[PDB]
Subunit: 475 residues, 4 copies
């Protein structure tokens, strides 16, 4: 393995993605505050497959299937139906290891728009498919069957078919398994959610021979629910992988618990996606079933601790919006001064704000935003008055009160229409804004600059020019 | 260092985030196809700070500043103004290392909504601030000044102040520097974009003493432009860090090139955010300036190769929408069958589709969606006819043609109104749908189930019942 | 002097004589009933001069006739231009063609004139030009339309502007016709009342009665300062005019618009069809009589009874919408079946309703697939039990076996017509290929089937209903008969 | 026999005698001009019976009078109910109160009756009930309103339904009045023409003239199958009625609606103000005369000239909007300044325009901060050069020193009024604290300042303008004088 984690040469990217060459995928024990069975002697370790450079667990099937199925100088296009993770990993490995840039992605039409934009981001050619979002591999109307049929014709087209290619689950027998066993020699239970079942079958078949005492717990999505990644128990019946020989028990977990635990994991420091909390909740449901039955101590080793390892599949960033939909507004701190998110949209440049000596030197027109009676009493000679209802002498600063910033910016935007700008002939000349303290003036310069007017504000407003330049006659 | 990358015990998360305990942050040489100076003997290596478990470069200042500034049993709240990355890293370290769950985030009101939702995701208390999105630390109206002033009162409130705390740039002297030098002993040039300038100052001050021959290149945002992370040269004038002694040259890069190079890096396998392409473009601009001047060979070592290292700061996932706004629709493959993204929104369950023997056994009402003249000629006795304009005998399958799926699902949704459902008394009984081939029927069962009707389809439609059940009289 | 005793006008000058106030019968004068005269017990009799009963329907025909007769130059005048509120220039257009053969009549109006009233000018063939600024400008306001109209007739020798606001022939027409008619129609007159807009009507009545029977009281009426009613004007806007109206009135009353429309509404329902300025004139008379009665000097107007005459200026038909805006829901009976006003919008033909034997014969004569279809709107289970072979079942939740006729219950017709419109979308019409075929509608009720024909016919579908529901064709259905 | 020679009606029965066709002058008969008679050269004279000139304004007053006189039972009849298209039940309400003191008149109408016509029934005090189904149902259609109205009078002893569709007193009223009047008004009559809705008018004219002068041709007019005009009906819907209309007509013409409105529009502009069914009747006469003239048998109608009389049924005022929908842009003069119809919506008072010395004295008398403000609408640089001390500068791009008066250019008024409305938002009104103060407007032009006063006054701001622009106050500004 690369001890320095430094990769150079013409094959740096190849070795960087190589599971045997890179450091082993991190295995981190979760904190005690998140483990409700800690006092019972249960230790839960998270295999952060999201910490692979590809950021998803699908890089192991993708690496193994492409190495096995691709034909040199005979494969020019890769097609695959996926829920997102596999086709991203295929897109990267096809270019890094096989020099193939034509990767076509088949996804359900009901997949979220952020998930869809992420597919285009990685250079994928996406085709949407109606009907079931998770079609059976033998459904002739689903993308899995269509991708496999498009690969039989045009021999350059390759469909590795993650749903029924043995190289899928064999990748976890080759890498994911032999890492957890060495990282956790005292492992008593391995847990993984089943999408294609490749992860769980690989882990289950490996631990079937290596340390047969390890309990193998699979997690499926509850009937009628949906979690990105795994599938329901009904959708796992037709699959031909030996998952029935790779599991010792099955748990069913819903989507609300999955997103809840995923959120709890990310704030602890283990940044992982919804299916990771899905897998952890499945482990919680089984551990509580033995504790309720009093048989939890049967999984313990010579020392009373029970070492459990569960898979964390990907990062939660593409799913962040789904958390707010599935979970309530609780467990999310509301945004303070939320109204500002749509009422101060334009940029501010510190070069627009000038000292009174610098502004009056150029004098080009000068605009005064104070009240008309305050303007009559005293103002800079030669300046135009343009009052505002939201701004008087006693008005608090815009940047100290969220509402008056909402009022002043709106009134400034509504005041500087195309007719009023030409009414003062502001177009094509340097405009200087004057205020009481300069804060309203700086908000005004952010409105005018976005409209093409070369506006500038005087820091301190009329209060600064009187003290900095006492000799200038107000009149 | 943890050779196995396995972390157990009560301090597993602490050691997992520890830069000295974890494996060194990966340093990967970029492919030749992305290096336009490869033939000139230039080798560019990417320091993937995004590969830290916190996924951003700000974990080094956050770790170092919190260790230095926090007071045990005296600090209960952490407040900080940031562009996003720092306050995420502060939120995690405050809980992992200091048991502080009250972290308040000050951000500009003009930061994108996905970036804002990510702040709430990590458990942050966000306050929006108007005015400049990147305020000067001495701007009394900006969040940097306000956070520092709120920390002087209520001594439990802590503001580490990344913009003027020396522990910021010192963190990269302690970790980021001593890793790149060991990972790349032949390094000739180090490159980093300057936001708080902590990364570049740390790298510049370290290489100032360790291997003084290394050229130190800083990158700033072009005037008037904006890149998430770095700042402009104008905003770096007032900062008190010794960045002017840590750089040997300055480059200015715009936002379009930043997002373009970041996109090119992600598809190569180096998944990093916009500021990473921003830093790489700065290196390209300086290398091309020496090649145009013919002085590029002055940076070469004994062997003709020039080893350059540049920082990759974070992941591009929170910025994915900004790529489509900044970059054109080119370099993005358009979504095929895009119309399906809003015209087949409801789920399909394989249990709803039944064989003809299973459906006619229950018979509860039976619905036939064929044309009325096709229904008159032959239909299942006892069934109601409900024709559709978008479906006749010659109509292609919905799942084979995107437009007819758009037509049939719409007509089905428009047909099964509340009045028509009660007109056929479909409420409270098992409804079975009949079609020509069963495809339109399965689209109909996805419309009715979402409306509360326990609908089911017959696979093969009327064509299957006649062959599977020949003895049933049609009439 | 002699008037048409047959009210029959023939020859080439039939139109000229028909509009002549000397040829035609006198403008009718009618005593209002006691139910509208609150002072009838006090001995006052109030008579209405129905100027609206002239062939032109407005009081403005008298000055239009007199001004044009005076100002027009035959063989030389070819264009008439006048600024008015609406009634004057209509009367000018009629007279310009009838008496002078002039068709180029241009109307200068305010830009704030209501859209219904603007179309009425176009209806009578007027050339309307809108003028910004005050709708009722002073005659010397050089911005207003009164001044420019007077200058365009000065600038050109062929353009004529009679100027109703400054021409003496305006009020002189009432000294010639309206006054003498009322005097002869009511010799015992003791008070004459009229509103003042141009003041022409009141100045004429006041100047004539000043010498002819000087004992008659002359009572003008002006609109209150805040109000405005069509026709007259307020006292403020009566200051610039040069007509001797102050010498024509003995007192002036101010009346609001609500009282004007209210009383004008009460006059039409009595049989005296007249517009808002008519109730405006009568209200001024009521106010002066009431103030005089409360003070006890009501006997001062009498001779030995008090006969009062007031002017009714035009018809209310152009103003109908204004009555509902200015008056309340009271004195207006609400619509009994208001909901039906937007739920049966389409027509019926009676020929669409066919006898059962006739309809079923047409459906069977034509081919069932290509030429004609039959729609059965009953429940699906009833349709399965018995139906006409070859018909399509389109059930409606609105109709049942016990549902009464939709034309006997307003809500049933509303619900049935709504569902019929909601079910017969163009997608469903094409789904059954109803386009271009003869459609026959069978239902439980049969009256519901007629509603279906109206809905289907309005879209282009040649639909027909079977008279009587499923009951009329029970003799033709053996399956239905055997289930009894 | 004797008619009111003074057209003056007094006493307690003034309304009764005013509506009496025997007391009042005969309904006028007027020969249409040659410009409207295409066969005038052939020796035909066409006369219009202006039934619209009755005090009720519609032909339906004759059957309403006769039916109620026959059917009403004094001291016993207290409610009148009738299904009609609109004109009949209005005439019933007037007669029910005038002749019988009955105010409970309920009108059964179709739900498809236009909203303007529905308000006209409420205007005359009718109780309107809408009926779904066919708007013109057969009298024996038990769903329609004709049948239920006839049964409600059968069910109750106090409810009366005269039933214009089946009562002989309908057509008998024209044997009594309309026929004899036309016969005496036109003794040489050789053809009588009228449309058929209830067929009462034509049956009456046809039955009377059948015995009185049997040589007169009787020509009915029906609406074409596809068209419909208010009043008459098509031949198809004339089948169920029991009136002897076939024995009353010698020929029947069919006329479309477009020709009806077109000819009716040509009759009003000639001075014969009449509605669409009147041009409908005249078009049927033109068609029969033209067909007869082309065949060469036009001389067959003559005696030794051909005198033809046709019925004019009502006034066009309720139908004005329909004319623009059915007719084209031709024969309608367009509005000259159409753009101004929505860009100067508010009024002016003339008192708002003050002389320069008067306005500046008011502004200086009151306190400048609390009581009054002055707005200067000139350019900012001109305001800086010279202005009234204490005034606020609100420049307008629309106005300049050389810009003409907005009331002399329609686009200038449009732009200036738009910007004035666009600049004087309630934010700007509060920003200058204009609320509750006397506002004085100074501008380059002064006429532009009046537009500002109209805009400001309509919102609640007590604004006034200085007569004359900056030129009228140049003598009061020393700085301006010294810059010359």
């Amino acid at each position: 393995r690369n001890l320095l984690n430094a990769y150079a040469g013409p094959n740096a990217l190849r070795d960087y993605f190589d599971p045997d060459c890179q450091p082993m995928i991190p295995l981190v024990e979760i904190p005690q505050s998140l483990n409700p069975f800690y006092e019972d002697g249960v230790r839960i370790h998270a295999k952060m497959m999201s910490m692979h450079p590809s950021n998803n667990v699908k890089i192991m099937p993708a690496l193994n299937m492409l190495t096995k199925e691709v034909q040199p100088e005979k494969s020019k296009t890769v097609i695959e139906y996926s829920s997102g993770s596999t086709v991203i990993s295929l897109a990267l490995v096809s270019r890094i290891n096989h020099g193939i840039n034509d990767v076509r992605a088949f996804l359900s039409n009901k997949t979220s728009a952020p998930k869809l934009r992420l597919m285009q981001f990685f250079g994928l050619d996406v085709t949407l498919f109606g009907g079931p979002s998770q079609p059976a591999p033998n459904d002739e109307r689903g993308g899995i069957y269509r991708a496999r049929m498009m690969a039989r014709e045009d021999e350059a087209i390759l469909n590795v078919d993650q749903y029924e290619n043995d190289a899928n689950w064999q990748s976890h027998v080759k890498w994911t398994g032999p890492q957890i066993h060495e990282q956790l020699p005292s492992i008593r239970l391995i847990c993984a959610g089943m999408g294609t079942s490749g992860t769980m079958t690989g882990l289950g078949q490996y631990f079937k021979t290596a340390k047969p005492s390890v309990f193998r717990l699979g997690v499926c999505t509850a009937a009628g629910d949906r979690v990105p990644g795994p599938r329901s128990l009904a959708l796992l019946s037709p699959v031909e992988f030996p998952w029935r020989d790779s599991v010792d028990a099955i748990e069913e977990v819903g989507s609300k618990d999955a997103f809840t635990l995923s959120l709890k994991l990310c704030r602890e420091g283990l940044i992982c996606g919804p299916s990771s909390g899905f897998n952890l909740q499945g482990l919680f449901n089984y551990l509580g079933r033995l504790k309720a039955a009093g048989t939890l101590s049967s999984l313990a080793g010579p020392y009373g601790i029970i070492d459990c390892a569960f898979i964390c599949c990907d990062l939660p960033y593409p799913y962040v919006d789904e958390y707010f939909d599935k979970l309530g507004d609780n467990a999310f701190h509301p945004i303070r001064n939320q109204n500002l998110a749509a009422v101060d949209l334009y940029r501010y440049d510190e070069a627009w704000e000038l000292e009174p000596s610098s502004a009056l030197s150029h004098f080009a027109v000068l605009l005064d935003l104070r009240k008309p009676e305050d303007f009559i009493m005293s103002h800079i000679p030669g300046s135009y008055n343009l009052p505002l209802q939201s701004s008087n002498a006693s008005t608090p600063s815009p940047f100290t009160d969220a509402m008056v910033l909402e009022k002043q910016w709106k009134e400034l935007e509504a005041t500087f229409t195309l007719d009023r700008i030409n009414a003062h002939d502001l177009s094509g000349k340097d405009v200087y804004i004057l205020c009481y303290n300069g804060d309203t003036a700086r908000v005004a310069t952010s409105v005018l600059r976005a409209k093409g007017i070369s506006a500038s504000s005087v820091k301190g407003g009329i209060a600064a020019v009187r003290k900095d330049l006492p000799q200038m006659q107000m009149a």
